[PDB]
Design a protein. Structure first.
Lengths: 116, 116, 116
């Protein structure tokens, strides 16, 4: 999985252990090994929702499977609660997109996942 | 919709009302409600096009529908004109990708849009 | 092609000619013209892989075709070797996602690529 979290909160409001705790959460929810999870954090960014600059997170989640309709309800419940607890965002200020990827469309260790 | 605008123009060159006006432009071109529109702006970024550092915008537009082939000509015309008027970019320096999403692949308010 | 390279390496460690060389590498690997290749470099960024902050690149490659299973094998070998040589990244610290786009989902010069 490859996760991007962008927020207009300042970098100092995203605790240093954010990536590591989000990696655990997704490892568990998506049944994926921790060494196959990358997290990007972009804090202090210009972001608006409804043209408002109130605190918000816009999140992208890519994974080779583990993203069925019912999985995504669970990932969303968990990620949203996690952003409430660690970022103090309201439940309605956490916007997530999922991308369900084929193994021919990911490259790792010098070749694609399908050709590993 | 969830829109990302990256530019090598400086942040001072992307006016403060940019996100507001883009939000209005998309609400109207897409017939989507203002409160379901997120805009990220990343200015002052390293970007090349044909390896040139001339001013350019690379834009991503995600939405659940409202992105048919025909819709996208309209969105492209309006977004490009808009970048011309507010960022002074040439018509041929505005690069846009559209991502037409299923509602099981979007998380908002703690669950998927499909489960709302 | 529209390529995003994010890394936790500092900006001063990603050479000024990075985007030139990557533009040539992709024009050649994908048989795409240089003037239809955009590259965004985001360095200095928070990124973890396996929760580790060791040097890493997370790369997104969008293109209208030129992304078959076979093509992606070659793109991956090339970009990975290129990251090793210019960024001193280990072979297993280059994570790439490919997005194979329809021409109705790409806006350029004020209309879709499909309608050009
Ligand atoms: O994202 C997946 O689901 C995946 C599953 C198995 C192998 C690779 C994978 N790709 C992403 C990745 C590679 C290294 C770190 O993140
Ligand atoms: O992207 C859409 O078309 C959409 C439609 C209905 C609900 C949510 C939606 N996107 C996620 C969102 C929530 C807030 C801002 O963006
Ligand atoms: O990405 C492609 O495969 C492509 C092919 C033909 C025309 C445009 C294209 N992409 C959008 C673009 C990138 C740089 C300028 O425009
Ligand atoms: Zn599942
Ligand atoms: Zn094998
Ligand atoms: Zn600013
Ligand atoms: Zn307005
Ligand atoms: Zn038509
Ligand atoms: Zn620089
Ligand atoms: Zn060259």
């Amino acid at each position: 999985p490859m996760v991007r979290v962008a927020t207009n909160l300042p970098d100092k409001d995203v605790p240093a252990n954010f990536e590591e705790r989000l990696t655990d959460l997704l490892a568990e929810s998506m049944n994926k090994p921790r060494n196959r999870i990358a997290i990007e954090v972009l804090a202090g960014q210009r972001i608006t929702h409804g043209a408002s600059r109130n605190p918000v997170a816009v999140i992208k989640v890519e994974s080779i499977g583990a993203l069925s309709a019912d999985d995504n309800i669970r990932h969303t419940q968990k990620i949203t609660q996690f952003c409430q607890d660690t970022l103090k965002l309201p439940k309605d200020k956490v916007i997530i997109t999922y991308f369900d990827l084929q193994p021919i469309h990911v490259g790792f260790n010098g070749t694609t996942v399908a050709a590993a």
